[PDB]
């Protein structure tokens, strides 16, 4: 349903977790670069965690592409959704987290009419 | 490994666009970029380079 | 150094205007290739005459093949070698089919018995002993007796497999 | 007949490795009856299956297969290098693998 693309290659799917974020609770997992003079991670000794670097950058042709092959576009209403009317093979609409259930029903109906893919069609559905 | 004889990733050290955000100066830069690229006249290239110059490098005449 | 070949190397001590056609000195050098043969030639020429590679030239390098490579010969070899504490001259006798094989055996034997590396050995002379009873080393004389036969006791056959099912025998 | 085998027996020895660093992407296989790289050249390119069993039935069987192939000879004693679609688990060091006769050139 999306534009043809090369095989999507992720050079590093594992998250870059901050050093010792598994050792101390106060050290969050959000990546921080070690600045210590003796840091084994900064010095890149074998057996330690890898650090984010530009070499891991994804192919520009497949960058930002979801597994379906679309780029995610956040939509808050029908006017936001309709910006993808001529771009249904490249963009997929994602309804914003704070959209009410009835507005989600309206947006889903409009996206179905316009052939726009919705990444989260089951949010705030009838239970 | 390569025994580099010069600094790697060295920027040219010359301006390639004005530091100014003047839209009209940018339009002039575009016009003289086109002229310098597609005329082969040294005047157009030197004018294009002069359009990049800072204020202290463009003393009043 | 390696499996040896013998080369004749003739060098010149490059001519000048006063002395054209210099005396064309020659050596028989055992070496594994021609680069090493020429290097050894220049080394010994610098040991013998006032000349160096820059002031001379190599006129000819030619491999000398064994005249009778399939005739068993006794060779007498005069060598000079540097030990850890001095320099010594030795005479040894080697039974082989060629000068190159005898010289390889000589280098192996000097390395084994005197820890003499290639760099420490000078081959003074290699000459075939034409007449037996001029062989003066018993370890070669014992191989010149009439109708020499000897067994090879305790034969050890190499197994192609890790395990054997027969408790093998060393008969021969 | 009593025998039905159409593969050569082999043993997963280890991964490709240096003294202290291994490479799980390449496995070393000892093929029965192969003692030289000249012999192993015959088995170059042959498909290999590691066949193992699981408790959970998946797609109509409790037997699962990891497929790979011989890529090149290894060493002087007939060991071969092999690459698999998924690397072997490394609990299979010493486990038996099957080297099939296809793709065949006889």
């Amino acid at each position: 349903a999306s534009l043809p693309h090369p095989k999507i290659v992720k050079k590093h799917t594992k998250k870059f977790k901050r050093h010792h974020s598994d050792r101390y609770h106060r050290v969050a997992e959000n990546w921080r670069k070690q600045k210590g003079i003796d840091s084994v991670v900064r010095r890149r000794f074998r057996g330690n965690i890898s650090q984010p670097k530009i070499g891991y950058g994804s192919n520009k042709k497949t960058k930002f592409l979801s597994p379906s092959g679309h780029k995610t576009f956040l939509v808050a209403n029908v006017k936001d959704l309709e910006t993808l009317t001529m771009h249904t093979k490249t963009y997929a609409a994602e309804i914003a987290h704070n959209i009410s259930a009835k507005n989600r029903v309206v947006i889903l109906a409009r996206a179905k009419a316009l052939g726009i893919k919705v990444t989260n069609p089951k949010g705030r559905l009838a239970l | 490994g390569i025994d580099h004889t010069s600094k790697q990733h060295k920027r040219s050290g010359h301006r390639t666009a004005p530091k100014s955000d003047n839209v009209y100066l940018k339009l002039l830069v575009k016009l003289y970029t086109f002229l310098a690229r597609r005329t082969d006249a040294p005047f157009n290239k030197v004018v294009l380079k002069a359009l990049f110059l800072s204020k202290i490098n463009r003393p009043p005449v | 150094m390696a499996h040896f070949k013998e080369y004749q190397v003739i060098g010149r001590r490059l001519p000048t205007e006063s002395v054209p056609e210099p005396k064309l000195f020659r050596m028989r050098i055992f070496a594994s290739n021609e680069v090493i043969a020429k290097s050894r030639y220049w080394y010994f020429l610098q040991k013998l005459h006032k000349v160096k590679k820059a002031s001379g030239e190599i006129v000819s390098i030619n491999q000398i093949n064994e005249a009778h490579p399939t005739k068993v010969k006794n060779f007498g070899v005069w060598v000079r070698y540097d030990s850890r504490s001095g320099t010594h001259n030795m005479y040894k006798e080697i039974r082989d089919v060629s000068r190159v094989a005898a010289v390889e055996t000589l280098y192996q034997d000097m390395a084994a018995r005197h820890r003499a590396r290639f760099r420490s050995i000078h081959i003074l002379k290699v000459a075939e002993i034409e007449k037996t009873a001029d062989v003066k080393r018993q370890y070669v004389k014992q191989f010149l007796t009439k109708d020499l036969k000897f067994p090879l006791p305790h034969r050890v056959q190499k197994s192609t497999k890790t395990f054997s099912y027969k408790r093998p025998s060393t008969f021969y | 007949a009593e025998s039905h085998r159409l593969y050569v027996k082999g043993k997963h020895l280890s991964y490709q490795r240096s003294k202290r660093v291994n490479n799980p992407n390449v496995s070393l296989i000892k093929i029965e009856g192969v003692a030289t790289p000249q012999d192993a050249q015959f088995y170059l390119g042959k498909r290999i299956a590691y066949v193992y069993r699981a408790s959970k039935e998946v797609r109509g069987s409790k037997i699962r297969v990891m497929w790979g192939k011989v890529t090149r000879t290894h060493g002087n004693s007939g060991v071969v290098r092999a690459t698999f679609r998924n690397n072997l688990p490394a609990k299979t060091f010493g486990a038996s693998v099957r080297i099939f006769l296809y793709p065949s050139n006889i």
Partner: protein, 197 residues
């Protein structure tokens, strides 16, 4: 090539045999070693006894029950030589060692099975003639192994029974060699010989 390989350790150069067995174990072959008391070590008996006493003097100073254990039996001496060459602290090394059994003599499970030898570890094939060597049973007895006499008596009994079995087998083999001695000039035999059988 067999599910279990039974090596007759007699005269087998304990270190080289241990190398062979360790490689087989790590490659996944089940090995049973019999007659460990008849293994050999190169070097004089006094040399190897002094080596064992140097091993014996090594022990944890503050508690000898923690230090290296000095097993006296020949099978355990071989097992030590083999464990020092298997990565025994890993799960893989533990599995490889579980694939191994070492015995003094030939116990009843294996006295009726084929025993193989390892030529690359055989003393007669490896040691230069005239070099002195030690016998593992004698060394073990000298360093405290208690069962040389019992193993010797049971080995003598087993050899008697095995000699009777082999006399019967040799008689049957003579009968078979007679049976295929005839029927060797038949057309089937000539065709088999033409095909190499």
């Amino acid at each position: 090539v067999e599910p279990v390989v039974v090596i007759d350790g007699k005269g087998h150069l304990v270190g080289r045999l241990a190398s062979v067995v360790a490689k087989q174990l790590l490659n996944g072959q089940k090995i049973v070693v019999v007659r460990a008391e008849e293994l050999n070590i190169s070097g004089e008996f006094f040399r190897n006894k002094l080596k064992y006493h140097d091993f014996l003097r090594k022990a944890t100073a503050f508690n000898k029950t923690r230090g290296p254990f000095h097993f006296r039996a020949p099978s355990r001496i071989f097992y030590k030589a083999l464990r020092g060459m298997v990565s025994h602290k890993t799960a893989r090394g533990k599995a490889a060692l579980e694939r191994l059994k070492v015995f003094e003599g030939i116990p009843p499970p294996y006295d009726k099975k084929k025993r193989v030898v390892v030529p690359q570890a055989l003393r007669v094939l490896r040691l230069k003639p005239g070099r002195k060597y030690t016998t593992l049973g004698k060394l073990s007895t000298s360093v405290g192994w208690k069962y040389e006499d019992v193993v010797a008596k049971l080995e003598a009994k087993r050899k008697v029974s095995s000699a009777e079995y082999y006399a019967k087998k040799r008689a049957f083999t003579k009968k078979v060699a007679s049976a295929n001695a005839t029927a060797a000039e038949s057309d089937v035999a000539k065709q088999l010989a033409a095909l190499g059988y």
